Amino acid sequence: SLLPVPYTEAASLSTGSTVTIKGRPLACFLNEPYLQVDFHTEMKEESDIVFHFQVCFGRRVVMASREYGAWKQQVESKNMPFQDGQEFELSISVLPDKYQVMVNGQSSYTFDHRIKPEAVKMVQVWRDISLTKFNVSYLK
Amino acid sequence: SLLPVPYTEAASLSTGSTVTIKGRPLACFLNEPYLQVDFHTEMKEESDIVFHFQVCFGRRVVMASREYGAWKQQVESKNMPFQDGQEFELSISVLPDKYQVMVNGQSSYTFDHRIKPEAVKMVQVWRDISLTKFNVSYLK
């Protein structure tokens, strides 16, 4: 669809920021398409990842960070609010102590800050989706 | 690059057929891009899969079949001939008893036929790659 995927955008985040994403999986859930959102410390795709969010649609969600090149402390969730064949709206809010992921208006995942969100310089959205909206708030 | 991804092409296979694919991963290996090739029994993406081939670049390869909607007998390989950042050439030959996967000219994976390859009607190539060539032989 409309936006290029992998989608890369320079970004700054602090408490009160929201990243909003609207997209659709490229395959039915039986084929297990993926979605990934990574908040990076630099514009280079190989830079460290403050917040890694990976959906295997219809199956599970994994969250982690990547620090000095190494994956740290993967956590896993079976919560699966995404619907087979449907467009989704994903919202990632930066709270004082954690990221909160809303899916279609419903709180679905949280991830405690391991690194200050001020370290984020870039967000990348990729894998098996099409993308029609990506927005970061810059109000505060 | 040149071909659309997910790439879908109707196909027929028998002993002596070769499927040739040329492409490049969309991300460095540190980001673990995927490649998937599925030989389907019908044109519908939710149809059964005679041969499922999924690379997690730099990590592992999984092979399976999907029969009446259910994944059957996943096998796993740590063989990883693909090179970080490089274009690859993948060849899948239909032998009498198995598929043989060549990577950059080197025999790398084999998968015994669980279903006659005559059941194949469609090949799909997808996930985190760009694609410049896809070819099936029809000589025999």
Side-chain angles (χ1 to χ4, degrees), chain A residues 1-7 22-24 26 87 129-132 134:
Chain A
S1 298
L2 271 146
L3 294 172
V5 178
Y7 183 84
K22 192 171 183 106
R24 177 185 314 262
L26 290 177
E87 170 187 81
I129 60 155
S130 68
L131 210 60
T132 61
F134 180 94

Coordinates of all heavy atoms in Angstrom, one line a residue, chain A residues 1-7 22-24 26 87 129-134, unseen atoms left out:
Chain A
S1 N 0.8 -1.2 0.0 CA 0.0 0.0 0.0 C 0.8 1.2 0.0 O 1.9 1.3 -0.7 CB -0.9 0.0 1.2 OG -1.8 -1.1 1.1
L2 N 0.4 2.3 0.7 CA 0.9 3.6 0.5 C 2.4 3.7 0.9 O 3.2 4.1 0.1 CB 0.0 4.6 1.2 CG -1.2 5.0 0.2 CD1 -2.5 5.4 0.9 CD2 -0.7 6.2 -0.6
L3 N 2.7 3.3 2.3 CA 4.1 3.6 2.7 C 5.1 2.5 2.3 O 4.8 1.4 2.3 CB 4.2 3.9 4.2 CG 3.4 5.1 4.7 CD1 3.4 5.2 6.2 CD2 4.0 6.4 4.1
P4 N 6.4 2.9 2.1 CA 7.4 1.9 1.8 C 7.7 1.0 3.1 O 7.7 1.5 4.2 CB 8.6 2.8 1.5 CG 8.4 4.1 2.1 CD 6.9 4.3 2.0
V5 N 7.9 -0.3 2.8 CA 8.2 -1.2 3.9 C 9.4 -2.1 3.5 O 9.4 -2.6 2.4 CB 7.0 -2.1 4.2 CG1 7.4 -3.1 5.3 CG2 5.8 -1.3 4.7
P6 N 10.5 -2.2 4.3 CA 10.8 -1.6 5.6 C 10.6 -0.1 5.6 O 11.0 0.6 4.7 CB 12.2 -2.0 5.9 CG 12.4 -3.2 5.1 CD 11.6 -3.0 3.9
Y7 N 10.0 0.4 6.7 CA 9.8 1.8 6.9 C 10.7 2.3 8.0 O 10.7 1.7 9.0 CB 8.3 2.1 7.3 CG 8.0 3.5 7.4 CD1 7.6 4.3 6.3 CD2 8.1 4.2 8.6 CE1 7.4 5.6 6.4 CE2 7.8 5.5 8.7 CZ 7.5 6.2 7.6 OH 7.2 7.6 7.7
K22 N -0.7 2.3 11.3 CA -1.9 1.6 10.7 C -1.4 0.8 9.6 O -0.7 1.3 8.7 CB -2.9 2.7 10.3 CG -4.3 2.2 9.9 CD -5.2 3.4 9.7 CE -6.6 3.0 9.4 NZ -7.6 3.2 10.6
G23 N -1.8 -0.5 9.5 CA -1.3 -1.4 8.5 C -2.2 -2.6 8.4 O -3.2 -2.8 9.1
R24 N -1.8 -3.5 7.5 CA -2.5 -4.8 7.3 C -1.5 -5.9 7.1 O -0.5 -5.7 6.4 CB -3.5 -4.7 6.1 CG -4.2 -6.0 5.8 CD -5.1 -5.8 4.5 NE -5.9 -4.6 4.6 CZ -7.2 -4.5 4.9 NH1 -7.8 -5.6 5.3 NH2 -7.8 -3.4 4.9
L26 N 0.2 -9.0 5.2 CA 0.3 -9.4 3.8 C -0.2 -10.8 3.5 O -0.1 -11.2 2.4 CB 1.7 -9.2 3.3 CG 2.2 -7.8 3.2 CD1 3.7 -7.8 2.8 CD2 1.3 -7.0 2.3
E87 N -7.2 -4.9 8.8 CA -6.3 -3.8 9.1 C -6.3 -3.6 10.6 O -7.3 -3.8 11.3 CB -6.8 -2.6 8.4 CG -6.1 -1.3 8.8 CD -6.8 -0.1 8.2 OE1 -7.8 0.3 8.7 OE2 -6.3 0.4 7.1
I129 N 3.9 -6.8 6.4 CA 2.8 -5.9 6.4 C 2.8 -4.9 5.3 O 3.9 -4.6 4.7 CB 2.7 -5.1 7.8 CG1 4.0 -4.3 7.9 CG2 2.5 -6.1 8.9 CD1 3.8 -3.1 8.8
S130 N 1.7 -4.3 5.0 CA 1.6 -3.1 4.3 C 1.3 -2.0 5.3 O 0.8 -2.3 6.4 CB 0.5 -3.1 3.2 OG -0.8 -3.2 3.8
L131 N 1.6 -0.8 5.0 CA 1.5 0.3 5.9 C 0.9 1.5 5.3 O 1.3 2.0 4.2 CB 3.0 0.7 6.4 CG 3.2 1.2 7.8 CD1 2.7 0.2 8.7 CD2 4.7 1.5 8.0
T132 N -0.2 2.1 5.9 CA -0.8 3.3 5.4 C -0.6 4.5 6.3 O -0.8 5.6 5.9 CB -2.3 3.1 5.1 OG1 -3.0 2.7 6.3 CG2 -2.5 2.0 4.0
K133 N -0.2 4.3 7.6 CA 0.0 5.5 8.5 C 1.2 5.2 9.4 O 1.3 4.1 10.0 CB -1.2 5.9 9.2
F134 N 2.0 6.2 9.7 CA 3.0 6.2 10.7 C 3.1 7.6 11.3 O 3.3 8.5 10.5 CB 4.4 5.7 10.2 CG 5.4 5.6 11.3 CD1 5.7 4.5 12.0 CD2 6.2 6.8 11.6 CE1 6.6 4.4 13.0 CE2 7.1 6.8 12.6 CZ 7.4 5.6 13.3

